[PDB]
C-alpha cells in the first residue's frame with residue numbers, strides 16, 4: 001500500500017475520532033497505537049462496547065480490510081459510527097499507513 005495516500009485518508013476520514021501515535025489521546029474512539037497483532041477491544045484506558053471487546057479476532061491486514069469496508073457489519077453493536085471505505089485500494093493504502101504509524 002501507498003503510505004502517503006493512506007495518511008491523507010486517515011486524516012480525512014479517521015482523525016476526527018482517533019489518534020495513532022504512542023501515548024496519543026483517546027477521543028471519540030481509542031488511540032490506535034500498537035493495534036496490529038492485538039485482539040479487538042484492548043487499548044488500555046478506553047471503554048469499548050461489549051461487541052468490540054468480544055469480537056475476539058486479531059487485528060492485521062486482512063481483518064482490517066474487512067472491518068474497514070463496513071465496520072458495523074463486522075462488529076454488530078459497535079459504537080464506531082462510520083460508513084466504511086468502499087474501494088479496496090483506499091483501504092490498502094490506509095492500512096499500510098496504520099501499519100507504520102501505529103508501530104513507531
Ligand code: HEC
Nearest residue numbers: 013014017028029040041042043048049052078079080082
Ligand atoms: C477511519 C477509516 C477509521 C479507522 C481506520 C478506524 N476508525 Fe474507529 N472507532 C470509533 C469508536 C467509538 C471505536 C470504539 C468502538 C466500540 O467500542 O464499539 C472505534 C474503534 C475502532 C477500531 C477498533 C479498535 C480496537 O482496539 O479494537 C479500529 C481499528 C478503528 N476504529 C479504526 C470511532 C470512530 C469514528 C467516530 C465518528 C470514526 C470517524 C472512526 N472511528 C473512523 C475510523
